[PDB]
Design a protein around this nucleic acid. Structure first.
Length: 58
RNA sequence: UUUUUUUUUUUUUUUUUUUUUUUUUUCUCCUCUUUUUUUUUUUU
């Protein structure tokens, strides 16, 4: 019963689609976007992703 | 004492041409474990 619910609450997209750069120019300048390097743990490497300014990406 | 006649190896040579490696399939796919990540230092 789960199966149909998880498979029909997934539709036909897997990842957020990207977008242009001038957006990122502005989003920086206006002050709503930080940007740094990104590393990963290695015991847990599918979950524990960090964004060195640390932002936990789950 | 046994004369005379019954052809034979197809004729021909003095014709133009402006293309080009290959060639045509097989789907989506659960990466297991002390961690933040250590870090100066000196002898190459």
């Amino acid at each position: 019963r789960e199966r149909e619910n998880e498979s029909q609450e997934s539709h036909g997209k897997e990842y957020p689609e990207h977008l242009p750069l001038e957006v990122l120019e502005a989003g920086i300048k206006s002050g709503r976007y930080i940007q740094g390097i990104l590393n990963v743990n290695k015991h847990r490497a599918q979950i524990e992703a960090f964004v060195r300014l640390d932002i936990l990406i789950h």
